[PDB]
Amino acid sequence: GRTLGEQWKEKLNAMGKEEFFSYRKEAILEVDRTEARRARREGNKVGGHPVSRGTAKLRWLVERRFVQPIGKVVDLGCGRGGWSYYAATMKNVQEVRGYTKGGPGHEEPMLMQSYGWNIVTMKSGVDVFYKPSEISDTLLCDIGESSPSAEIEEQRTLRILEMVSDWLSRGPKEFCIKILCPYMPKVIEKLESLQRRFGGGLVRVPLSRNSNHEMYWVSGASGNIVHAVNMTSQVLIGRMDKKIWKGPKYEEDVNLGSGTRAV
Ligand SMILES: Nc1nc2c(ncn2[C@@H]2O[C@H](COP(=O)(O)OP(=O)(O)OP(=O)(O)OCC3O[C@@H](n4cnc5c(N)ncnc54)[C@H](O)[C@@H]3O)[C@@H](O)[C@H]2O)c(=O)[nH]1
Ligand SMILES: Nc1nc2c(ncn2[C@@H]2O[C@H](COP(=O)(O)OP(=O)(O)OP(=O)(O)OCC3O[C@@H](n4cnc5c(N)ncnc54)[C@H](O)[C@@H]3O)[C@@H](O)[C@H]2O)c(=O)[nH]1
Ligand SMILES: C[S@@+](CC[C@H](N)C(=O)[O-])C[C@H]1O[C@@H](n2cnc3c(N)ncnc32)[C@H](O)[C@@H]1O
């Protein structure tokens, strides 16, 4: 046969617009960004409004001890820097280094003055697939591009998995990696291998939209991957074909404050 996630991806692509858009936000957690937008507009950089939604995503993991940034932090595919700035707010972090592709169709790093910004250093024009690995205490990675093909998503995920190992072999004991397509059998066996060597486990962040099955490979987690995935697949499938769409659960975004920090 084929995996539950496999079937999810097929059932997903067969939905109408009205159904899709309505489904992808059903029962999910969502951050209110409207004030972030206002700040952005006005150019206010010291109101603690994150640069993206991803800040709230990482916060969700961190607060549940799934990952706990420490020492030198490296954020691969940092984009605007939601994850980088958030790591810089934490007392145990001393150095935040981010890398992202930039250019056409890609998010450029964004300057904010959230608490700790001064130890953040983001660099654009960098393709992590050709960037020599560096030492780190914490390794973050949030790379992964959607596609209506699960096979595409598979190989994309596999390329990512292949490359993150090199960064991990450098001894960071705290980590968080986006697995774009975790439900595919080749991805699973690869994670099964990587889990044996590096530990950790896979976790679904409820802030992620129902239109994607992304899970995060995190060092503060553990346990059976194949079960973990399937559970998420039953939830996501369980949300389909709904009667009265209740919509998302709105939460307040994280406040990263302002000002520098001496290290
Ligand atoms: N190459 C393309 N990328 C796109 C397109 N539409 C959206 N995106 C990007 O996908 C990403 C996911 O979109 P989502 O809306 O979920 O991103 P976030 O929710 O994390 O950003 P928010 O700031 O919370 O609000 C989202 C957006 O607000 C816009 N935004 C937010 N910040 C900016 C800046 N700095 N410069 C230009 N536009 C910005 C942007 O269009 C996003 O859709 C995001 O980086 C977008 O820039 C698109 O049509 N083409
Ligand atoms: N039945 C349908 N299925 C769809 C449809 N669109 C996408 N999909 C399926 O859902 C999957 C994911 O959908 P989504 O696009 O919501 O993916 P994400 O939420 O993970 O993308 P994000 O980057 O998190 O933000 C999403 C979006 O931001 C926009 N975005 C982001 N990147 C881009 C680019 N490069 N170009 C144009 N627009 C872009 C776009 O409007 C998306 O809704 C996708 O792989 C498809 O299998 C659709 O219209 N109908
Ligand atoms: C969506 S962002 C992740 C969000 C970020 N963690 C945050 O909190 O805002 C992922 C980024 O990885 C970048 N990316 C994709 N492929 C890359 C590559 N090969 N090398 C470096 N960055 C890449 C994309 O430009 C994209 O903006």
Swiss-Prot record:
Residues under site feature: mRNA cap binding: K9, L12, N13, M15, F20, R24, S146, R209, S211
Binding-site positions, S-adenosyl-L-methionine: S52, G82, W83, T100, K101, D127, V128, I143, Y216
Domain mRNA cap 0-1 NS5-type MT span(s) in chain numbering: 1-262
Feature type site, description Essential for 2'-O-methyltransferase activity: K57, K178, E214
Recorded topology in the membrane: Peripheral membrane protein
Modified residues (Phosphoserine): S52
Compartments where found: Host endoplasmic reticulum membrane; Host nucleus
PTM info: Phosphorylated on serines residues. This phosphorylation may trigger NS5 nuclear localization.
Active-site residues from the entry: K57, D142, K178, E214
Site (Essential for 2'-O-methyltransferase and N-7 methyltransferase activity): residue numbering on this chain: D142
Quaternary structure, from the entry: Homodimer. Interacts with host STAT2; this interaction inhibits the phosphorylation of the latter, and, when all viral proteins are present (polyprotein), targets STAT2 for degradation. Interacts with serine protease NS3.
The protein's role, per its UniProt record: Replicates the viral (+) and (-) RNA genome, and performs the capping of genomes in the cytoplasm. Besides its role in RNA genome replication, also prevents the establishment of cellular antiviral state by blocking the interferon-alpha/beta (IFN-alpha/beta) signaling pathway. Inhibits host TYK2 and STAT2 phosphorylation, thereby preventing activation of JAK-STAT signaling pathway.
Protein's UniProt name: RNA-directed RNA polymerase NS5
Species in which this protein is naturally found: Murray valley encephalitis virus (strain MVE-1-51)
Residues of the full protein shown: 2534 to 2796 of 3434
